[PDB]
Amino acid sequence: MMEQVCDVFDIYAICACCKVESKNEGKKNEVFNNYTFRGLGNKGVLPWKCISLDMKYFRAVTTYVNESKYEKLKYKRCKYLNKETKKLQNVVVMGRTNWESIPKKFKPLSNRINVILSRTLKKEDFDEDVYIINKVEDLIVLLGKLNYYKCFILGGSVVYQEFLEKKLIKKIYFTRINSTYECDVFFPEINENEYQIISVSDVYTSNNTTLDFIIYKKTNNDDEEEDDFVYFNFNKEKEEKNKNSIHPNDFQIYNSLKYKYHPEYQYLNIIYDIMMNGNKQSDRTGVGVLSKFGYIMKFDLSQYFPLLTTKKLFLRGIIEELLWFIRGETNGNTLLNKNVRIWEANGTREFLDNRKLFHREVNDLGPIYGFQWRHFGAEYTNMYDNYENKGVDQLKNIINLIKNDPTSRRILLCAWNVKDLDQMALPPCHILCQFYVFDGKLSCIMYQRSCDLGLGVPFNIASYSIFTHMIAQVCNLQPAQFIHVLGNAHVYNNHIDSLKIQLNRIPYPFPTLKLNPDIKNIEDFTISDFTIQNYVHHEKISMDMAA
Amino acid sequence: MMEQVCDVFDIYAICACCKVESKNEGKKNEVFNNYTFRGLGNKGVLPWKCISLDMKYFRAVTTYVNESKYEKLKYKRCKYLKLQNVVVMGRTNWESIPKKFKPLSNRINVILSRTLKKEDFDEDVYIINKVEDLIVLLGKLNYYKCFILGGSVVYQEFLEKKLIKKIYFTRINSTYECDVFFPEINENEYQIISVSDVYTSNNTTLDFIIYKKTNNDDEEEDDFVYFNFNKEKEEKNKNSIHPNDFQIYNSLKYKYHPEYQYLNIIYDIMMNGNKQSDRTGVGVLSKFGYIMKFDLSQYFPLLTTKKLFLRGIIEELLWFIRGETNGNTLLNKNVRIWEANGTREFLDNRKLFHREVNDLGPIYGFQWRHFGAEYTNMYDNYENKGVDQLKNIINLIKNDPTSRRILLCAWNVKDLDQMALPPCHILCQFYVFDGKLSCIMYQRSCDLGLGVPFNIASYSIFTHMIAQVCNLQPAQFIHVLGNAHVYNNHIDSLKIQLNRIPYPFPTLKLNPDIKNIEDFTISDFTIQNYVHHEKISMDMAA
Ligand SMILES: NC(=O)C1=CN([C@@H]2O[C@H](COP(=O)(O)OP(=O)(O)OC[C@H]3O[C@@H](n4cnc5c(N)ncnc54)[C@H](OP(=O)(O)O)[C@@H]3O)[C@@H](O)[C@H]2O)C=CC1
Ligand SMILES: NC(=O)C1=CN([C@@H]2O[C@H](COP(=O)(O)OP(=O)(O)OC[C@H]3O[C@@H](n4cnc5c(N)ncnc54)[C@H](OP(=O)(O)O)[C@@H]3O)[C@@H](O)[C@H]2O)C=CC1
Numbered sequence A: 001m002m003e004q005v006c007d008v009f010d011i012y013a014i015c016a017c018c019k020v021e022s023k024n025e026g027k028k029n030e031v032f033n034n035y036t037f038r039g040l041g042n043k044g045v046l047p048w049k050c051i052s053l054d055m056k057y058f059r060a061v062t063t064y065v066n067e068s069k070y071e072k073l074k075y076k077r078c079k080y081l082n083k084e085t086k087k088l089q090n091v092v093v094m095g096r097t098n099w100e101s102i103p104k105k106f107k108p109l110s111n112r113i114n115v116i117l118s119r120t121l122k123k124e125d126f127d128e129d130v131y132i133i134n135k136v137e138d139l140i141v142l143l144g145k146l147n148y149y150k151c152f153i154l155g156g157s158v159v160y161q162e163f164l165e166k167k168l169i170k171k172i173y174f175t176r177i178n179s180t181y182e183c184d185v186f187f188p189e190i191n192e193n194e195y196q197i198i199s200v201s202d203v204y205t206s207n208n209t210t211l212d213f214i215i216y217k218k219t220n221n222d223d224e225e226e227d228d229f230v231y232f233n234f235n236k237e238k239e240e241k242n243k244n245s246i247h248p249n250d251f252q253i254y255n256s257l258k259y260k261y262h263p264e265y266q267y268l269n270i271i272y273d274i275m276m277n278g279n280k281q282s283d284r285t286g287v288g289v290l291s292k293f294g295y296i297m298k299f300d301l302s303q304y305f306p307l308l309t310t311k312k313l314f315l316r317g318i319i320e321e322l323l324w325f326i327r328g329e330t331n332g333n334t335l336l337n338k339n340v341r342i343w344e345a346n347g348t349r350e351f352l353d354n355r356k357l358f359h360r361e362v363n364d365l366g367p368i369y370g371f372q373w374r375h376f377g378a379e380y381t382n383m384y385d386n387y388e389n390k391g392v393d394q395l396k397n398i399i400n401l402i403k404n405d406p407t408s409r410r411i412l413l414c415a416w417n418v419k420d421l422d423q424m425a426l427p428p429c430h431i432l433c434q435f436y437v438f439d440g441k442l443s444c445i446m447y448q449r450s451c452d453l454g455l456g457v458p459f460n461i462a463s464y465s466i467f468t469h470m471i472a473q474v475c476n477l478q479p480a481q482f483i484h485v486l487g488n489a490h491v492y493n494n495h496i497d498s499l500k501i502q503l504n505r506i507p508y509p510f511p512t513l514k515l516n517p518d519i520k521n522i523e524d525f526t527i528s529d530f531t532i533q534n535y536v537h538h539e540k541i542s543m544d545m546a547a
Numbered sequence B: 001m002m003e004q005v006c007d008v009f010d011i012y013a014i015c016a017c018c019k020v021e022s023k024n025e026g027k028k029n030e031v032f033n034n035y036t037f038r039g040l041g042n043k044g045v046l047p048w049k050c051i052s053l054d055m056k057y058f059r060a061v062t063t064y065v066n067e068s069k070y071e072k073l074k075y076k077r078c079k080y081l082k083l084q085n086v087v088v089m090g091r092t093n094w095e096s097i098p099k100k101f102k103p104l105s106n107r108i109n110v111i112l113s114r115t116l117k118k119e120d121f122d123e124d125v126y127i128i129n130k131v132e133d134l135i136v137l138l139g140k141l142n143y144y145k146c147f148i149l150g151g152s153v154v155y156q157e158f159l160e161k162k163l164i165k166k167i168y169f170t171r172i173n174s175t176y177e178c179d180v181f182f183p184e185i186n187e188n189e190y191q192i193i194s195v196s197d198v199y200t201s202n203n204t205t206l207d208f209i210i211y212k213k214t215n216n217d218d219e220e221e222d223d224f225v226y227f228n229f230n231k232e233k234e235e236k237n238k239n240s241i242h243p244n245d246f247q248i249y250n251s252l253k254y255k256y257h258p259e260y261q262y263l264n265i266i267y268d269i270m271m272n273g274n275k276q277s278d279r280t281g282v283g284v285l286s287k288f289g290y291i292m293k294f295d296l297s298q299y300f301p302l303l304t305t306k307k308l309f310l311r312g313i314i315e316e317l318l319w320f321i322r323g324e325t326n327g328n329t330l331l332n333k334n335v336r337i338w339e340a341n342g343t344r345e346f347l348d349n350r351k352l353f354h355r356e357v358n359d360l361g362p363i364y365g366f367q368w369r370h371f372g373a374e375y376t377n378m379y380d381n382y383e384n385k386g387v388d389q390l391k392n393i394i395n396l397i398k399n400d401p402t403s404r405r406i407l408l409c410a411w412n413v414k415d416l417d418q419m420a421l422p423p424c425h426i427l428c429q430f431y432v433f434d435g436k437l438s439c440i441m442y443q444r445s446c447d448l449g450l451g452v453p454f455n456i457a458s459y460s461i462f463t464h465m466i467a468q469v470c471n472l473q474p475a476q477f478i479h480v481l482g483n484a485h486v487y488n489n490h491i492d493s494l495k496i497q498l499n500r501i502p503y504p505f506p507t508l509k510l511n512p513d514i515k516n517i518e519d520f521t522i523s524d525f526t527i528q529n530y531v532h533h534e535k536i537s538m539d540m541a542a
């Protein structure tokens, strides 16, 4: 073989990039890609004030060392140099401009061997314990003479540019700051053919912005308790049911990722599990699906708003549906007048007649969600009736229980009214919501009996995450977790090709949801009280590509 | 000497033991322990006809080899004195193996004996005269691992001479006639390191456990550490629960036994649960949202780390099916599950001043058979009133098996205040695929210590019942927990329970003649081969 310099001396690059203030030349239908995150700095300093989580991450990565692994690292390097043979520390290299941006109390960077690249400055110009080098090659010379774990290139742009340039980077620890700031310096555009993403972290919120961490890798080129594992799997199937009908070769990017910790993967992995292990069934006359039974997803609303990023989604419609529910409405015309067609097909003359609702007016969806939420138990008449003080106002009741009896285990909202089922345009999919309160934080579990993974679920996750935010707010609580329990989870065969494409896309840090803070009652929300900020997503996809 | 013979030459023991019958009692024991499983053979052959899974397991283990790991041992071995494994058995044992299957293929067969014509068999079939002579035969061969296949006499000698590093023990959870037994294993000398998943093979459940002698690439490895840079150092309640008390639990490497889905939740709630003085002043540790799945086709999930009785919960189930709400019916059968919820004082505090004692209101049974009807009293005739959900789900399962609307719901929002108390088991949803029925039950409130164990058994039984009257085979029972909690008063008992190793699960047998959900009677249910640890009082309050 022919050892590569970056491999022998373990040279890595670590950075943090925000989005750049681009000029809206006429289309807000912005096209997003990895290059969306490229802002490095502005006016000699970072573009942002303080994002402490990234600092913590930066410090942890650049200071972490594994002494037990060094003995191996040393041998490799000496062998490479043909020179067969104080806590261990990592080396950090940075441009002069980067060095000058660091506050005096933080330089030199603690527990790290600091190296600075410069031409205009010499060792005499520095009081600190640091190594000065005037050219990339000197670093390689220095590294061959030092005892260190790993080497991290900290920037700036010029420094990144030349290192990536000479392919002296083994991996790029890239922090994606999902917010926009003014920038004058940028990270070099990464050659998609020279570097591939191999891992994505969980998403977090720090100093009013979400962010995640991804890793780019450079293109290709007791043991007795380990056998017990092999024995215990003596009775496993070599393959997966639909493997031959799906072909893993199609999920190259998806399978090539080592660490998939981004929350969106809970959704993506379920899609994958169903495609590979789902049972073939025939739900509605003709149409076919792949199905599984029993899944659970958890989204941390305090850290992000889980709006899928591997495809484009709009929320105006589902928000109006939600306000429609809250108003206790069952009149489909209200949504149609706002150009929301979610329920249009379930309210036609033909659809109603086939549900045996011959005496139901067009678009009168019957005692569905809204009616059940505000009047469960009342006798449904028509969509124009005034059901004031009729039935059980569940909504009002759960809000009251959350405010005065937070530890109660009976805080549930249920739409599955067994008596009214046949009067509904169709039985509800979202059976119930149960709330949980701890230390001023509100969590919600929603049980879905039937789940269309390809089309519905994406919207369903958003609907209830927003609802949890709304309920938390009017009860003076902070949103915590939104827990989605899936009963019959299916993938329509018509969606397969589209989901294959989606599964090979890498998620972007999630966006955030902002609610007008003045709203103190669940019934006072209007469409303009909701704001989805920093939504970065891939190209929209039609689940079924029929034409 | 830091390590001895067994560790040096890697000598393992592999066996399969069934339970033994006694001319004293039938199939019901009083006390159970690891020695419960000790049946090795009967009249020169195995106690049982055929258990193909154990045969498959035995074969897979005795033949498996990892050549890229050999020299690691070879080095250590010599530094003391197609790669295959070595198998040692007694003559009597060798005599039982059939001709066509003898000698054991792909393995180095050795026969410990005293009177064997070493010239009557090929040289590929080694023979030793004494236990301590095997160490000599190993120092000359190229083998990966050495497996002692018995028999009883052989095991005994090897165990006494402490030449056993590990014991791959198959627990056959059924009884047979035996005349030979496995030597009682000294717990002080050996400890269970791993327990597999539970299986059913040839009409018996069994699992595999591993005994261990008490000794008393990197690229993405660092990346793993970086992604955990924000993870909490210690566990929320470490100090209060003290993980050191769970030595056995923590000492187990592989915990694949289904009972661990339950046990792990207990552990997770203890270690990470949120302290909440929820109700009555009584404290609890709570978490939100868990899911357990049990394979009813392979076993009945009746907890074995403690003793559980089922007559009570079966009668409750039949009571639900009859659509009853009369607490007295149960009390007169000494089923007191609902007694506290039906007293004058409890009803009055529920504001049910006009409700008769033990008249629980429109609860489970009423909703199951009459959802929507107007509840009057527990004695009224409700025939043809309200929606009969039970009848409907059964018809849906039979006539429209792929329906995604097969739900049985007890949470009738309109009747909640009229019930002695709102249902904990909100609903059941069914799934039918390839002649198999699965069930999901969503529980809003879960008392991990007392309730959940019974809840699991209760709905597993119900799944079997529905499946049978629909001519389907039961598949999975899926348990979804909402507010999952451990009462503080149960903590010490659960600590004890968490350190007990599960036994292979029992099986449930229903009278096969019952084909209508309403025709079941208490005598139609039987639990078989229930092996369990001694009962535990969750509330140790004397
Ligand atoms: N968010 C993030 O992850 C990062 C943000 N930044 C930001 O970007 C800005 C700095 O980036 P940038 O302007 O490109 O400056 P750099 O930090 O990259 O420094 C460039 C300078 O360093 C020296 N240098 C670089 N290469 C060599 C070489 N081969 N030989 C000798 N000397 C060399 C020279 O200094 P000299 O003049 O002495 O000759 C040169 O002018 C700051 O605003 C900073 O806050 C930077 C890195 C990461
Ligand atoms: N379920 C399971 O996992 C197992 C079941 N079994 C069952 O148990 C029965 C066999 O056990 P068992 O009756 O004890 O007979 P064994 O298989 O243990 O063989 C005993 C005989 O082997 C030779 N032998 C054993 N130890 C020594 C020694 N130290 N030195 C010299 N020779 C030795 C002697 O034969 P010789 O007469 O030539 O002197 C001795 O009489 C069978 O019915 C079999 O099916 C056995 C093992 C495992």
Ligand SMILES: O=c1ccn([C@H]2C[C@H](O)[C@@H](COP(=O)(O)O)O2)c(=O)[nH]1
Pocket: A426, A427, A429, A430, A450, A451, A452, A453, A455, A456, A457, A460, B404, B405
């Ligand atoms: O909010 C919703 C509403 C519907 N569906 C899907 C699930 C099923 O694919 C179909 C409804 O069919 P039934 O389960 O009612 O048969 O719509 C969702 O995923 N989310």
Ligand SMILES: O=c1ccn([C@H]2C[C@H](O)[C@@H](COP(=O)(O)O)O2)c(=O)[nH]1
Pocket: A409, A410, B279, B421, B422, B424, B425, B445, B446, B447, B448, B450, B451, B452, B455
């Ligand atoms: O079948 C049952 C019935 C009750 N409980 C428990 C859960 C709660 O600890 C208590 C009911 O109290 P509330 O959740 O209603 O407050 O009983 C179970 O675990 N299983």
Ligand SMILES: CCc1nc(N)nc(N)c1-c1ccc(Cl)cc1
Pocket: A014, A015, A016, A054, A055, A058, A094, A098, A099, A101, A102, A153, A154, A155, A173, A174, A175
């Ligand atoms: C804490 C910011 C930060 N986060 C990440 N992920 N990478 C980096 N390279 C830096 C960084 C930028 C400039 C200097 Cl001068 C030092 C470090």
Ligand SMILES: CCc1nc(N)nc(N)c1-c1ccc(Cl)cc1
Pocket: B014, B015, B016, B054, B055, B058, B089, B093, B094, B096, B097, B148, B149, B150, B168, B169, B170
């Ligand atoms: C397949 C039975 C089996 N299963 C297990 N788990 N262990 C064993 N030691 C044997 C066994 C019994 C008698 C002979 Cl002669 C050979 C092997």
